[PDB]
Enzyme design. Sequence first.
Site, PDB file in Angstrom:
ATOM      1  N   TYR A 116       0.791  -1.232   0.000  1.00  0.00           N
ATOM      2  CA  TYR A 116       0.000   0.000   0.000  1.00  0.00           C
ATOM      3  C   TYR A 116       0.826   1.287   0.000  1.00  0.00           C
ATOM      4  O   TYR A 116       0.394   2.302   0.546  1.00  0.00           O
ATOM      5  CB  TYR A 116      -0.936   0.016   1.211  1.00  0.00           C
ATOM      6  CG  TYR A 116      -2.114  -0.928   1.102  1.00  0.00           C
ATOM      7  CD1 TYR A 116      -2.994  -0.845   0.026  1.00  0.00           C
ATOM      8  CD2 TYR A 116      -2.374  -1.872   2.099  1.00  0.00           C
ATOM      9  CE1 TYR A 116      -4.113  -1.674  -0.057  1.00  0.00           C
ATOM     10  CE2 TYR A 116      -3.492  -2.708   2.027  1.00  0.00           C
ATOM     11  CZ  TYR A 116      -4.357  -2.600   0.949  1.00  0.00           C
ATOM     12  OH  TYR A 116      -5.478  -3.397   0.883  1.00  0.00           O
ATOM     13  N   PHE A 148      -5.612   7.712   6.518  1.00  0.00           N
ATOM     14  CA  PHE A 148      -6.053   6.375   6.900  1.00  0.00           C
ATOM     15  C   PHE A 148      -4.982   5.300   6.758  1.00  0.00           C
ATOM     16  O   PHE A 148      -5.255   4.119   6.979  1.00  0.00           O
ATOM     17  CB  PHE A 148      -7.267   5.986   6.056  1.00  0.00           C
ATOM     18  CG  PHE A 148      -6.993   5.956   4.572  1.00  0.00           C
ATOM     19  CD1 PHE A 148      -6.289   4.902   3.996  1.00  0.00           C
ATOM     20  CD2 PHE A 148      -7.441   6.987   3.749  1.00  0.00           C
ATOM     21  CE1 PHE A 148      -6.035   4.868   2.626  1.00  0.00           C
ATOM     22  CE2 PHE A 148      -7.192   6.964   2.378  1.00  0.00           C
ATOM     23  CZ  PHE A 148      -6.489   5.903   1.815  1.00  0.00           C
ATOM     24  N   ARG A 170     -11.986  -6.027 -10.901  1.00  0.00           N
ATOM     25  CA  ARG A 170     -12.282  -4.752 -10.250  1.00  0.00           C
ATOM     26  C   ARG A 170     -13.790  -4.525 -10.294  1.00  0.00           C
ATOM     27  O   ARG A 170     -14.390  -4.041  -9.333  1.00  0.00           O
ATOM     28  CB  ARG A 170     -11.567  -3.605 -10.970  1.00  0.00           C
ATOM     29  CG  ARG A 170     -10.058  -3.641 -10.832  1.00  0.00           C
ATOM     30  CD  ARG A 170      -9.607  -3.187  -9.452  1.00  0.00           C
ATOM     31  NE  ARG A 170      -9.776  -1.748  -9.265  1.00  0.00           N
ATOM     32  CZ  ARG A 170      -9.309  -1.071  -8.219  1.00  0.00           C
ATOM     33  NH1 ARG A 170      -8.644  -1.706  -7.265  1.00  0.00           N
ATOM     34  NH2 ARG A 170      -9.506   0.238  -8.128  1.00  0.00           N
ATOM     35  N   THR A 217     -15.278   0.883  -3.633  1.00  0.00           N
ATOM     36  CA  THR A 217     -14.343   0.792  -2.515  1.00  0.00           C
ATOM     37  C   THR A 217     -15.044   0.731  -1.161  1.00  0.00           C
ATOM     38  O   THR A 217     -14.709  -0.105  -0.322  1.00  0.00           O
ATOM     39  CB  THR A 217     -13.360   1.981  -2.515  1.00  0.00           C
ATOM     40  OG1 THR A 217     -12.615   1.983  -3.739  1.00  0.00           O
ATOM     41  CG2 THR A 217     -12.393   1.866  -1.349  1.00  0.00           C
ATOM     42  N   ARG A 231     -18.287  -6.715  -2.767  1.00  0.00           N
ATOM     43  CA  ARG A 231     -18.432  -5.776  -1.663  1.00  0.00           C
ATOM     44  C   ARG A 231     -19.904  -5.425  -1.453  1.00  0.00           C
ATOM     45  O   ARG A 231     -20.346  -5.204  -0.324  1.00  0.00           O
ATOM     46  CB  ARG A 231     -17.612  -4.515  -1.939  1.00  0.00           C
ATOM     47  CG  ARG A 231     -16.120  -4.768  -1.865  1.00  0.00           C
ATOM     48  CD  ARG A 231     -15.315  -3.604  -2.410  1.00  0.00           C
ATOM     49  NE  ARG A 231     -13.883  -3.847  -2.264  1.00  0.00           N
ATOM     50  CZ  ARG A 231     -12.943  -3.257  -2.996  1.00  0.00           C
ATOM     51  NH1 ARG A 231     -13.281  -2.387  -3.939  1.00  0.00           N
ATOM     52  NH2 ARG A 231     -11.663  -3.534  -2.782  1.00  0.00           N
ATOM     53  N   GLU A 260       2.321  -6.102  -7.574  1.00  0.00           N
ATOM     54  CA  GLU A 260       1.758  -6.788  -6.421  1.00  0.00           C
ATOM     55  C   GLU A 260       2.005  -8.293  -6.447  1.00  0.00           C
ATOM     56  O   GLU A 260       2.334  -8.893  -5.422  1.00  0.00           O
ATOM     57  CB  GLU A 260       0.261  -6.475  -6.331  1.00  0.00           C
ATOM     58  CG  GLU A 260      -0.012  -5.020  -5.943  1.00  0.00           C
ATOM     59  CD  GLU A 260      -1.437  -4.582  -6.217  1.00  0.00           C
ATOM     60  OE1 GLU A 260      -2.305  -5.456  -6.416  1.00  0.00           O
ATOM     61  OE2 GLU A 260      -1.691  -3.356  -6.228  1.00  0.00           O
TER      62      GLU A 260
END
Lengths: 153, 153, 153, 154, 154, 154
Positions: free
Chosen positions: B50, B58, B86, B92, B103, B130
């Site tokens: 990240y 955050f 995605r 998000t 989600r 990643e």
Amino acid sequence: ETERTLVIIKPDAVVRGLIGEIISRFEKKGLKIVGMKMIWIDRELAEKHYEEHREKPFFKALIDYITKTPVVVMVLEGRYAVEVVRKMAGATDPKDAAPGTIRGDFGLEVSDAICNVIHASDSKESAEREISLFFKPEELFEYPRAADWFYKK
Amino acid sequence: ETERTLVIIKPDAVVRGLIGEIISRFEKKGLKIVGMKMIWIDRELAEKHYEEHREKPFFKALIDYITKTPVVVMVLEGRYAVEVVRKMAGATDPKDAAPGTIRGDFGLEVSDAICNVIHASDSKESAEREISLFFKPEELFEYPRAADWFYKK
Amino acid sequence: ETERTLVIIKPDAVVRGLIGEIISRFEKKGLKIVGMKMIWIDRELAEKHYEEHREKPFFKALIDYITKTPVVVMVLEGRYAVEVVRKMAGATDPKDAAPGTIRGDFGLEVSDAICNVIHASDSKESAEREISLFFKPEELFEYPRAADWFYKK
Amino acid sequence: SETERTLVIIKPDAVVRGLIGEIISRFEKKGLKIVGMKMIWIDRELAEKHYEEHREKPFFKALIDYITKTPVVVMVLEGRYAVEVVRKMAGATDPKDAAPGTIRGDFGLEVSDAICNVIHASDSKESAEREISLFFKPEELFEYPRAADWFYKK
Amino acid sequence: SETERTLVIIKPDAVVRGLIGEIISRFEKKGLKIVGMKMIWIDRELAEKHYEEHREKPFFKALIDYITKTPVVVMVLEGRYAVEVVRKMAGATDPKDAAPGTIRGDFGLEVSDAICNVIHASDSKESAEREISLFFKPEELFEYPRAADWFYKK
Amino acid sequence: SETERTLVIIKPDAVVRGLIGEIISRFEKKGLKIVGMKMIWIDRELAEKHYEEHREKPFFKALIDYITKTPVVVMVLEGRYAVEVVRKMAGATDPKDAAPGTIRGDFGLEVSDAICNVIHASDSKESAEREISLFFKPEELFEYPRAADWFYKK
Ligand SMILES: [Cl-]
Ligand SMILES: [Cl-]
Ligand SMILES: [Cl-]
Ligand SMILES: [Cl-]
Ligand SMILES: [Cl-]
Ligand SMILES: [Cl-]
Ligand SMILES: [Cl-]
Ligand SMILES: [Cl-]
Ligand SMILES: [Cl-]
Ligand SMILES: [Cl-]
Ligand SMILES: [Cl-]
Ligand SMILES: [Cl-]
């Protein structure tokens, strides 16, 4: 408002064993299956079904695709069935189809044809034509589904 | 068009016992799991993953979140896998995610971090980076899924 | 951000045996059931619940519909529960509801009333009013769901 | 205590058919905890070691070919009497005989030269200990809380 | 007739784990009718009355603690031989012994000082009658048609 | 070989209740191949022929009424020991006795003058051959590859 639409569970769906899951989505929505059968479409019948695409570059691949293995043709009846089933199907190219739709949850990979799990009539007019192509009157039925009485006035 | 993307089944999903359900959505879509393992990410690895958020308010909560419990990192392969996954993931913030997305169906509650069930690479470039962070070449495989032959020409 | 909203599993859903499937969608989302009961709404209570529609042409049919058979009233608690549940419900007319939403996957057929599987409070204010209509304080509870601890700081 | 750890292998037939998630969900829904998991491609040496007790049996060759045909998913499940429980969940060795409701009963049927049966489940605590060691290093096994763990505190 | 009514309690472990809907769906899919249902938080007095036949047993205390730990969902199921049928659907008392396919077999395993087993199902028509009365007033039980009721008319 | 073909009838109760898809999915997930299928409305003559072995039994009339009440879905399933396997998947004839996990066990219960039991499954290879002929012409049965067929090549 009650209409009938034609749906073809394509070769990719049949080969992947998704016939039941697709049918269940229609039954759970409240749509009634008034006609259904597994057949193996030959090129002549396939070209009649997809006549509108005869002069498009993907025509041959499309005919190869729809005639690759047996398929399940079925007639769905219900309130605005045509537009509703089109909505349930999702975007033509599965990669663009929204999660929740049939193509959105089940489709992605393609061949020289855009494999997209099912076919759904694009209009009442087309549905009438397509239904006549695959079914005889003796193969279509009128009967009550469990909850039909609930909506009667 | 075939790409690889990295997905992390986050601590909230692992703790809630949703690993299987999440994986199934990818398998049903036609995506291939070419790499997968349960690991417990430490802060150093988490901050590298990240890095783009280092100067956001955050950041700390996010690192605490992703390292809270073990997670499942996996590599998905398939036609336009990056954008497709995605899309399957959804917004998000889970409360804004559409029903049908991962989600949208599984996420809602948050901590000091926006707990959102999974992570999905935002681009081919990011996926490459990643994937290299969590996997060695020996942990990634090339093999046929049942229906692969169907799409071959 | 935690709110409470009122949901009514309508007669069409009860008759079709969809109570469990509807409840599961809320539980899987992370929403907590803090109150629930099967009751048979009479016209007086129904008209109070739907007071806002008293002067609309479909009012009588709506009252007939909601009082047709027993229903399940329940209170859902969670982060922005009101807007979230409204989103999960989908478009008022099921034919317009997106696949993935409750009405999108389960609704379609209508009577003289737009049968749409469930009712969901349209706002925090309305939820407060509706909850008070069907529940007494003694029927609402505060308890931990399995994963509650995960989001605590 | 009653808490045990057993080894499960989601075999090549399940991986190829896209059944990894459905199998894992059954264990998660039962309340079993996944303390270790990874996709690997078993080689002949490892396959033969795992099935060493069958090296002196006719079907040995077909078995090794089968378990090494494609990558598999090995995982360690932890929970109350996990060994016997996962075995029960798996069902009869030959899927045609497995009861509906079990993993093999719902997902298995067809066979090759080997009796393809979806998954492998340790037969006993002794076998579980041995098998877990063959596929996992202690560094790959974790201790963490699942959502409802607190509910069962004695 | 063959139509009976039985009492089902979706216990605290199921409520906490978010399994209310899945359990209810199993009964609805079987064809059983929900004629009564509500979420309540059982108190010690009511818990002891429901399990009075076990008041003279060692595990009594843990049992009362368990059933009153969080709110539960009590419901009355109506249908052909409902008592024996729901019992069969529930599975063996100790979930580790319950067969895959049954509610306890698919969802239960872990225990506390009490044998947490997802739900309660009346053991007999006599127990069903007694239990239904403890939790429901006649005013909370309804007679209405489920979608397919007309199909079975004799 | 071990590959057999059996006849399955998704009866009127299942069609009416909207269970066609769920039933078909169970067979597809097991690995069975659908080589023939169609929705038809069975007439008394055909119904009596299919159940000729029961023409000299009390429940015959109710049975014919039941199987011809609405359209049904007849289908031929192909696979390793398909006859015994589909029978096992179907469960006990009277759904109240069928085990959870089986089709009748999960979906059936209520009865009319006939013992409504969701589906019909051929009892033996001999019955399967006879029944398949009654409902299907060779032209309606197909030979094609399912996705994982290649995996089991011997
Ligand atoms: Cl779409
Ligand atoms: Cl219906
Ligand atoms: Cl979204
Ligand atoms: Cl596949
Ligand atoms: Cl919508
Ligand atoms: Cl929870
Ligand atoms: Cl078994
Ligand atoms: Cl848990
Ligand atoms: Cl049992
Ligand atoms: Cl019903
Ligand atoms: Cl049985
Ligand atoms: Cl297959």
